[PDB]
Design a protein around this ligand. Sequence first.
Ligand code: HEM
Ligand code: HEM
Ligand SMILES: CNCCN(C)c1cncc(CCc2cc(C)cc(N)n2)c1
Ligand SMILES: CNCCN(C)c1cncc(CCc2cc(C)cc(N)n2)c1
Ligand SMILES: C[C@H](O)[C@H](O)[C@H]1CNc2nc(N)[nH]c(=O)c2N1
Ligand SMILES: C[C@H](O)[C@H](O)[C@H]1CNc2nc(N)[nH]c(=O)c2N1
Ligand SMILES: [Zn+2]
Lengths: 411, 407
Amino acid sequence: RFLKVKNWETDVVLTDTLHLKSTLETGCTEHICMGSIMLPVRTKDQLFPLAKEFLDQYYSSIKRFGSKAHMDRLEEVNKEIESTSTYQLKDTELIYGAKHAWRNASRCVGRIQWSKLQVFDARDCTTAHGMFNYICNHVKYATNKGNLRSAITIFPQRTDGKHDFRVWNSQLIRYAGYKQPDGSTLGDPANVQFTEICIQQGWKAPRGRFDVLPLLLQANGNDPELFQIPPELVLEVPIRHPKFDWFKDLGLKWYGLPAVSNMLLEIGGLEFSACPFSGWYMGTEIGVRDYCDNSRYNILEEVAKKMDLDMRKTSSLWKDQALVEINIAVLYSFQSDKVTIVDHHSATESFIKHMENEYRCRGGCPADWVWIVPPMSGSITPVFHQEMLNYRLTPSFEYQPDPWNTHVWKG
Amino acid sequence: RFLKVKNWETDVVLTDTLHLKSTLETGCTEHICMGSIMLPTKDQLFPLAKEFLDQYYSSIKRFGSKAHMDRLEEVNKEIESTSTYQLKDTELIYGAKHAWRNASRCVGRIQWSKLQVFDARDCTTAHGMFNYICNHVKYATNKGNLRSAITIFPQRTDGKHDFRVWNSQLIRYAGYKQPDGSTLGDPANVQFTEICIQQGWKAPRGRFDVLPLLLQANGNDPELFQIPPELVLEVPIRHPKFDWFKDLGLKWYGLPAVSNMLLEIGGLEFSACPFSGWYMGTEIGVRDYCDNSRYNILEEVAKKMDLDMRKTSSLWKDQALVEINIAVLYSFQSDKVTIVDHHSATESFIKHMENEYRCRGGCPADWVWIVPPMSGSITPVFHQEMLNYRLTPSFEYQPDPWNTHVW
Ligand code: HEM
Ligand code: HEM
Ligand SMILES: CNCCN(C)c1cncc(CCc2cc(C)cc(N)n2)c1
Ligand SMILES: CNCCN(C)c1cncc(CCc2cc(C)cc(N)n2)c1
Ligand SMILES: C[C@H](O)[C@H](O)[C@H]1CNc2nc(N)[nH]c(=O)c2N1
Ligand SMILES: C[C@H](O)[C@H](O)[C@H]1CNc2nc(N)[nH]c(=O)c2N1
Ligand SMILES: [Zn+2]
């Protein structure tokens, strides 16, 4: 079966075959499209075909499909599953596996980078204190004094589901939020619940607008423990604007390192429930989403005020004007301080070249248009006009439940 | 079976039941989502009519009444003999409004019940079609106070006597390839203009030449008519601060009118059903003016504003975009031509959604089309989960007639 996608700006048409290897479910049916929906303990029986699918893919990628080494490896894994209910990945397989989960991550606009990923193997870790040290090391390697390097740290896989490793933070670096008695929020409103958990557990909150949260780390299904990332490892950028000198007096800054810590990495049927990964920011993530979402720092009004835009009617497009100035400021600031950042034009241009390449060498590139198109200036980026196919390839990153909802407290 | 949609800005969660009446297909499956793809008998007709009449009699609180049963009987009788049926005026009007109500790609559906329906089912020739359409254009234009309207020509019969308006919209600008290598006018319309010239049109060869109408009546070869110039309201584009903006010499038409869709009601197919509303500002300012395949004006504007165009990260494209959009809205508003900005329309749509969840049990919506083409996440629609599904009565894409027509 062949599927075509067209670009409506260039009329270029691509043909997808890779979707034939798709496995998990989309949420959609012939009667309903769920394309804008944010969120839609294996038996041995289910595991060996998953392991086999993975190993065939890995051995083909190294041009050793059907070799003695491939066959011996299938037999070795088969015997390990029947006798222990699970198996262990070789380091090479873990590396291939993590890079491909990135390659396959349909909501990721950054994928032109996928083969340049530093994989830190933390499967010998046994305590939360051990997790902290691996994470500190990840953060310092990835930050690299502003010359950011993509990386992932991989903690031990799930066993019976009662011994999970998990990073309770959604991202390694985030600012606290504090709900005041009058209903106003201090800091980042989206992190109030999690800030409360950290406080309950003993965090002494500075209670300012940009307090870096502590890590809360669970090893081997034990209760999580709190650690402060050393301030000196947390690189931050004060936000200023190249023409507007009052911009700095807004008191804004943001952290350099975007790091996701709440997703589950599936490789060959194994589940890596703690697998923090980091890259570098696209400017719109901070300047549009973190700063201007009504539920986040929500600074549009203040900025428009300072610009003396006409704010009596939306049709003056004052929000749009302020939005652009904030985003200019974020890119300017990061560039000035020599911290890696990409703009949304550059990033979406790179993505389209990446996509085209994948279609030629791979037969496809699953992509989620809803997530790929940036949240400002949509149609002046080339991905807006690009038809995309969304499907699920493994290896993959998946959502999992928040651990505070499911953890069994030992006390 | 029952599905939840969440708004991620407000936490409001709604429950959709209306999707269980979804009839036609999405193009998606459990293995693949095609959400971003632009274009995914007597026996067959009676169940479609029944489906429709049931919903109609339900809507006027007479379901299972005698007049309901009697109408069902009459239409069945009529299809059994004639292989088709006629809608009553009341049914036609309900049907047209509901096709708008069900239009998943339309952000302006808060207005759905306020649609003026012009019944042109008595029309027999192309000259008649022209007269009806001029009347629609004049009515809808209303000196700049725009009013929603549809005009409905005769339904498909054996499919060899289709009425069609070959034009995609009632009002569009010509495009012309130049020897110079470039394109004059609207580059999207080069092929259709050629058809018009091939059919006799004396082309002016300017940048904003309104195309003539090519009307096919009763499966006949299409004929050419020029909309009266004094009925095609246009707006010159200027900017409230940049005095140079007017020197780009831009204008656009006030009347957005789709003319290439098919209207399906109770299994009947209306292949010519031009409809019109009013513009949302981004449509012109973002798409018509700034698409690379369209008038593609960003570079010229940027230069006039003296921005640093050396690097993408100065956001010069973004800055020029916003000003072009501010100019569109100010120009329409100063001339007193109805226009809506993307903030206002999207707030309206979210109110409409809530209304439809509360009163109908849902609202089919295509997020990819609903979220505006600039400033997405500063509008409330961006944060709203939506389910897309196909209800009837509906507006559908149909093949372009130059591909289908046998001359
Ligand atoms: C190197 C530079 C990178 C850039 C510029 C980048 C860009 C992005 C952006 C802008 C998003 C959307 C974020 C949001 O709206 O919250 C995203 C999503 C994501 N990317 Fe990346 N990416 C990069 C690296 C990575 C790396 C290293 C990984 C994993 C190894 C990764 C995996 C993902 C995943 C899984 C998502 C989906 C997150 C979710 O569902 O919340 N990306 N990418
Ligand atoms: C009254 C003001 C109206 C507003 C502000 C409005 C707004 C919009 C907008 C912005 C689009 C997107 C167009 C594009 O990107 O090409 C759209 C699409 C559409 N609207 Fe409306 N609408 C209006 C009236 C109507 C009316 C009167 C009807 C039918 C009687 C209608 C049916 C549709 C349909 C079927 C589409 C999809 C067309 C396609 O696939 O190209 N709308 N609406
Ligand atoms: C729920 N999703 C939004 C999460 N969010 C507010 C957030 C906070 N802090 C950091 C990120 C990073 C998301 C991300 C991850 C990666 C690997 C790269 C990239 N450019 N951005 C996201
Ligand atoms: C080719 N895709 C459609 C965009 N396009 C080139 C176009 C040109 N001219 C007019 C329209 C009208 C779209 C429209 C229709 C209606 C009823 C209301 C509205 N606000 N916009 C569209
Ligand atoms: C590929 C993609 O579907 C295409 O560019 C769409 C995206 N969203 C859109 N949204 C609207 N309102 N109008 C459009 O023409 C498009 N084009
Ligand atoms: C409801 C909708 O799916 C939601 O607001 C999405 C839209 N697109 C997105 N795109 C990105 N990149 N990140 C997001 O958080 C979202 N949120
Ligand atoms: Zn879908």
